[model samples]
Target: MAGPEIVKLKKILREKAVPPGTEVPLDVMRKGMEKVAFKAADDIQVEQVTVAGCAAEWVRAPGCQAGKAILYLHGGGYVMGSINTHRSMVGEISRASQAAALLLDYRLAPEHPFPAAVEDGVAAYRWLLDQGFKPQHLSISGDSAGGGLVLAVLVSARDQGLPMPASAIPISPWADMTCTNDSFKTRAEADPMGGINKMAARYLNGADAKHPYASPNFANLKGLPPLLIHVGRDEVLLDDSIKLDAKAKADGVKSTLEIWDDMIHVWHAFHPMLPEGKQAIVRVGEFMREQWAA
Candidate 1:
């Protein structure tokens, strides 16, 4: 529970960066991430591609082909972020898992709004299938808002009679857009980056927060695949991941909840500079390998 080095990086971002308030400037955010990714390019590989008419990219090591694919959803409260902004994180995931990753450029909210992101995600999944990757060889993952989309995508697939994925990994997921978690209220003071409540308001834009796509925590948990949830004790969204774990377990789904005390939300994404982040990637990779063997 002692302080982590990533906290120093968070401190710098908090002091220097502008908060994403009513509107998210996607270009600016993407530019900043591109700089970070450039520094970490030595450890991670990056490639760009278009999927389902949206811009996307693949991040992984030089030569790794396990026949497994990671469908990553980048987090921006469903408003901003593409493969470049999240390349550092996805690269670590791909390298650690020794798997090829397809990081999607799903449509965001407000401009695109509810169901657009969902439709984009579903289309991307179908695209993956058409590319010849079987459902058993695919795993879905995301962080923050992307984490919620990961769950929503699975639910949508199951409801639509699509084959279930082998597993799902949601990292410090923002599962509830309703801002109803007591953990959100309590941890906001401890969390360095605040204003999540306001972010939710902008993204929802008059939509009901309880709808399953908006808040997967309120959705039925039946038919979900094995789930691995990683959460930090210091994050407001900790309860979102916890609540999902509880609901999935209650529905007889296989679930593992790994809680890291003193870490920030999605701290694993900082693995380029944080040892814990590297360890997290290795853990996820091991999980993916085991799921593949099963």
Candidate 2:
């Protein structure tokens, strides 16, 4: 049985459901998302920074060890989302992982379009490397679209001969841009975030949906770092993460996939409001620590 907190969250989400087929204006969606905020922990400190000319923030926990870090990407389907919207969640991730996190506000789509976010992601990782952080001490992470970017960046880095990070955490990754996954249809009603096909199309902006960098499920997984993927059983994107994990393992990469019961997409975004969210973040921290130790 799901916890009381999870049940309550479901009720609240259902109450706020948008009408089917409604395409919310991008500005309106961004504003509405910004309204959902949480108070960050006292021990966490945020520093404004620039990574490769892109705006970014550093969410640091007091217990974080020097030279150990996570390069975090925020998910907004490539059309929305910002560092401000993810500050609290990133803070919790830093605290649990005992490592500082660099949250990048990569350029969004329908404006910057494809390759902009990918370029910014690679640039930020390069900047981190330039700062003298050893590849083995770093990990990359993100949720939803950002999670897919985590894989994209790793692929871009590898093609450029950059050293691989110790590990990667892709929470409910939107790895298949084609939107052909079975869950996309099977779990449509169960997923709180509806109209995924239209939302993804807005970000693609005429770009080839199957481009390996855009939809990492089609990428060559060889030589990539270890990966830990988390997805809610109830999400339409569940198959994206599932197939990515299978592909990674088949290609000889170390990969772990966790499917949570009765959870929704990017549930970790709820943090303190949802017990399962906190528990999932804790597991991610543990996974990162173990990767670092190895």
Candidate 3:
């Protein structure tokens, strides 16, 4: 059942939603995204740090295990989100999973362009390896563009002969850079995520949209680790998650897909504000723990 908080969130999104296909300057969009207030958690400790030469942070919660780690990527259409914007959510994940999280501030697009984010993601993973965390004890997770990035990094790491992580969690992933999915049209009106195609264009910057690194849906899913994907039924990227999960299973990969009723893209970002959000995070923690125990 949709709670009052979800109803309130949907109302706010409908009222202030950006029109589809709207074009705004990158700086303006970034500033607007950054303007959202940070939601701090009382039980988490955050430390500013650097990983693989990129700015990053460590989020630790009470009772977090010593060697288990979650490498998190922030989402902003590959243009705007920072570690600060996603700190709260990462902290909650840390608490739920009993694992410390490293939130990377990867280079964004239209300036850094394709391959940069991928490089940074792989580098951060290798940095984790260098820091003495075993691959079997580590996981990768993200939302939106960052969700796609989790798969991209895995693909890159696999090709580079790097060890695979224990599992991955991608929330409402934007895995199809070409935007050819049916939901792009069907759910566009219902989703708060607008200007997706335009944002993809800016991020591609002349690169092929179907490149495996840019769009993991095009990649060979064989040899990848277990994956759990969560997506909102109302999101424009719903098909992205659906198609990826189907393809992954076809390729013999272990994949789980959860479609939340009446939710929007990255709704888990609302956390304590939305009961469904909290429930989703708890499910994620359970999944990670199961994988670790196995």
Candidate 4:
């Protein structure tokens, strides 16, 4: 069943389509995205906090009653998203998880590629710990590229001996950026969003898309924390999340994979009015709450 919000989002994407490889000036893309994302910013109360040279939002849930913290990464293939674009999502996450969320606005790529997002994410996590948040009280999450970053940061943290988060939930993670996942070709025509051909081309420009930092699926997964991963069955990245889940479990990490049928990548972004979106948030919150409960 097609939800109303999904229908609207498709209409929006179609009306103001920005094709891949289209050289959109950064400032123009940033400003042009405001109206499209602004509507989602309503009703959520937020506070600004400085973390690792960037400003992040501390989003408050309407009925939350706990001290758990959710660290969020906004997705735009690491180049075009902001706290505003994901405010509604954070709000729902906050309310459902019963925890306040810190939404990171990290630096993007093409200007600061590879390791840049990883550095910011690691810094944010360390800063959260320094601010007195117990590792057990924290969870990390994101969608699309941010989802990929979440896994990258966790692997980085584990390798660096930093305390691991209680759990992680990456929605429709783009784990393999090399576009080499077999699903990319097999599911290309079935996917609503075109395959990785364009996004990878632009983001790669010349770099190796399969580089571990660029694609976390290529990283070691031992000692990682519990994970709750969600992917839309129709997405070409389905194998990305599914394969990661299998590898995570193989490495002895507790992991759960939820496949949302007939959905698009990170479909929860449209939950402002989509039933499936709302349900996904609730499920994520439940998993987080269970993991964070001490």
Candidate 5:
């Protein structure tokens, strides 16, 4: 049975949904998202830093090890999220994995445009490598557009001759910018969120919508690290994860796809008030440990 919090979460999401033909300015939307974000736990220590010109933070929970690290990207359709919006969730992941996490604030789009986020992602990963973090002891993760960036970073890093990380976890990844997935049509009414197609247009800003870096569902997956994708069954982007899983497997990369019944997009972000969210975060920690057992 779903928790009472899930019902509340769902209700809030529905309440926040924009009506059809209702236009919200980008700045207004961005501010609104920041206003609603949860705060990091008091015990979770955060150190500010810069990585490859992007604002970044090193987050550590009690007992978190220094040697292992995660490069975390926030999701907002490549245009909206920031460290301010996602630090709490990163703290949860840091605590669960017992590893320091670097929360990256990659440049948002409409102004930065295509290849900017991916470039920042790869640069941050490179920074991690230069910091003496062994590729095998490091992981990259994100949600929604950031989740897509996780896959994008992996492919770009490999192509640049950088060593692969142990594994990756992308929750409710918005991997297909084309927005032609069947789930968009089938789950339109059930999903609480909408309008990513418009967001994609703004982010692409005339860039190739199917560019592997922009839409990792079309990327070459060979030589990438093991990947784990979590998607809510009721989400519009359901097939993005499913298709990416098949493509990754076809390219001989080990990939695991998990569908959480009734969960909304990036449910892991709700760990503070949602049991399933915490459970999913714990699962990511378990999976990472298994892959990085060395």
Candidate 6:
């Protein structure tokens, strides 16, 4: 069953849905999305800063503690989003978790390809570590591409001998660049998200699609921190979160996967008007708090 808000969201999405394989120009998509992003609430403190050469920001509630940090990457299929889009959501999570969230405006695609986002993600993590936050108090999170990058950064960080964060949350993670999931066809009509193979290609830019740093589904997930993954049942990317969870569990990682019965992709982005979005973010905070106290 769906609520009135769900109905409203569905109508909005259906009205503006991009055809399954259609490509929307990057600039147009960027500008349009920015227009919809409301300013951060007065209570949520936002400070601009730089992290390891990447433009970044710190979003936190006044009472949020310093030692706990979350390195947040925004989702835009590796080419579209920035801190401006995800700031308030990060602030909500910051408020819930009682942690300062450092959101990265990592390099985007066509211009910054393959290893660029991965590099920035890892660099941001290392920057957090160098800033005196203990590894056990730090976590990484994102949605869609940034979600995949969360996994990539963790694996890459482990490969580079960096300390592990306490946990990670990857919501509707776009982990497999191959994009051959059965849900691609089955859920195509049901999901609001359109084809991003074009976007992925641009981000890959001739790089190996199966590379662990590029497509974390193939990444050996061992030695990573515990993970909490959330995905929507109606998403074309549903299988991505499912498959990534299986791999993480098989590789001895502690993984928790929640498939929301009727939700769509990255529904948490609608917290301003969606009760489910607000509730899910509260859970994000609760989960991280438990991990930190463990």
- Give the per-residue lDDT digits (tens) of candidate 5, residues 1-294: 766888898998888777877788999999999998999999999999999999999999887876899999899999898998999998988888888999999989888988899999999999999989999899999999999999999989999999999999998998889999999899877788636778899889988988999899999999888988999887899999999999999999999999999888898888888989999998888888788895
Which model is ahead, 1 or 5, in terms of lDDT?
5
In model 4, which regions exceed 4 Å deviation?
Answer: 1-29, 38-43, 194-207
> Mind giving the per-residue lDDT tens digits that candidate 6 earns over 24-50?
778988898788786776799888999
Off by over 4 Å in 2: none
TM per prediction = 0.90, 0.97, 0.97, 0.90, 0.97, 0.97
The stretch of ten residues in a row with the least summed lDDT in candidate 4 is 194-203
| lDDT on C-alpha atoms for all candidate structures | 0.80, 0.91, 0.90, 0.82, 0.90, 0.90
lDDT by residue for model 4 (90-193), tens:
89888889889999988776677667888899989999898888899999999998999899889888878899989999999988887678877777655655
Candidate 3 global CA lDDT score? 0.90
Estimate, for each residue in 74-159, the C-alpha lDDT of model 1 and write its tens digit: 88778666676777778777877778888898887667887778777877888888888999999999989999988888888788
Give the poorly placed runs of model 1, Cα more than 4 Å off: 1-7, 10-14, 17-40
Query: Which residue pairs show collisions in model 4?
Result: none
Q: All candidates: CA RMSD in angstroms?
A: 2.6, 1.1, 1.3, 2.6, 1.2, 1.2
Candidate 1 — number of clashing residue pairs? 0
lDDT of 3 by residue, 30-90 (tens): 9887788466588789888899889998999787999999999889999889988888888
TM-score, predicted candidate 2 vs. hidden true structure: 0.97
User: Clashing residue pairs in candidate 1, if any?
Assistant: none
Pairs that clash in candidate 3: none
lDDT of 6 at 187: 87
Residue 68 CA displacement from its true place in model 5, Å: 0.4
